[PDB]
Amino acid sequence: IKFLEVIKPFCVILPEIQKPERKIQFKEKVLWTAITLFIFLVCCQIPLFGIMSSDSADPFYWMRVILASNRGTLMELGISPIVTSGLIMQLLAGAKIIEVGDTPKDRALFNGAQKLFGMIITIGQSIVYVMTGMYGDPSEMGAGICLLITIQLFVAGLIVLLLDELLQKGYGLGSGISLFIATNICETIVWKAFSPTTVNTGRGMEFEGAIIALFHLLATRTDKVRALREAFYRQNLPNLMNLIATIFVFAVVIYFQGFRYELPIRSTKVRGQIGIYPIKLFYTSNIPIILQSALVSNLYVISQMLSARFSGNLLVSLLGTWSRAYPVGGLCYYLSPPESFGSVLEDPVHAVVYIVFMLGSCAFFSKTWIEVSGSSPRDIAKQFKDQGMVINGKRETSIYRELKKIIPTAAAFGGLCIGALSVLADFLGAIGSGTGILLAVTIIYQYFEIFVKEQSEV
């Protein structure tokens, strides 16, 4: 322990959340979760003070769903401090610079180091965000205004880590990453259905919310048949078919989320402890969706930055050609969903490649994650040996072999299945999209599975 010791004085200077005196009941853990997400939601509606012009094209638009970010607000960075600092912690632990340990004083030191790097990432990303050209020109903005925006994003990033740690310490129902990602996705879907925002294009005033539009169209046009057709088949604004597609995808993903292989196990050390070890089809809950989205979104940012500066280069053009900003050629084009059914017909190769990439990457990410997160059959077999658990119909030596048959298939096929559901949601035009809806369903199921876990104990 050499790296954690030198930064130890700098770790304790940040606020920490008190460990609960006793376990909080699930009733009040939901309430603190609701309070935590309410604070995050309020912070993501309050714009930064120093913004001069939010008119330029947004540079990080593709991570906004997976970073729980909102451009130009206090939640501009979103959960980026949590994701990046946690990544540095895993990379440092994986490469043996630091040790996570098990001593309560060592775990607190590990938490303090993660919080310290979250501030470093928050400050580093705040400067990068300012210099990207958003909020206006930094030279015209001024040193004081640019510094003030960094201060606002620094305290906001401190709040996110404080809110994230609040959920982890035992007051909430999980992590800030899962809660804040799902909260924005659920907020977006409800907004597309109930927003009172109205837009006029000449024909009249039309509500942006699909359900509000249906009631407005029926009343204004006196139960017109065309009003129902417009409410369901609206291309300019969200329509009811996209909402029905959203509900259909929710139902289908929920059905496959409940798929599980139930291993009948007994304990050999302490006899009488019998139970079921479930191997879910979605073995990796939503990591393949996050890993795929992060890979494509990060690749999009790199492609646009290289296209703007080093335009004309063959390698830059191969990485992606951009024409709002959407890919039209290069590698980034084949990683984007088809625009419409006509787009599939005119370019059948891109639709096939996108489906193959979406299924292949999610299947590959899922099977790779189990070899990193510690859910590989060898690591699960070791946990069985540590707890003395064996499978009913199999010998004590044949625990890893049976796990080798189920877990690698569950990860690879589960990632492929969760990759296909995102395509189906995208191809059906579901409000929420493929990544967002699948993220929302899987995160909510993690909260439901906590409820049944606490209920089963009682």
């Binding site: 304790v12 200077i13 940040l14 606020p15 920490e16 959340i17 008190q18 603190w32 309070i35 604070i39 309020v42 912070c43 309050i46 714009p47 930064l48 003070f49 206090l74 303090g112 003030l148 606002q152 305290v155 906001a156 709040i159 404080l162 809110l163 609040l166 007051y171």
Partner: protein, 32 residues
């Protein structure tokens, strides 16, 4: 170090939220 509870975090979060509102409210008055 300092170990605050869940309620101080809610208060500090609302204090920062109010401070940013004060920045805009002051900004409106100092520019108009």
């Amino acid at each position: 170090g300092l170990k605050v509870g869940p309620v101080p975090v809610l208060v500090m979060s609302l204090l920062f939220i109010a401070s940013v509102f004060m920045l805009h409210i002051w900004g409106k008055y100092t520019r108009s």
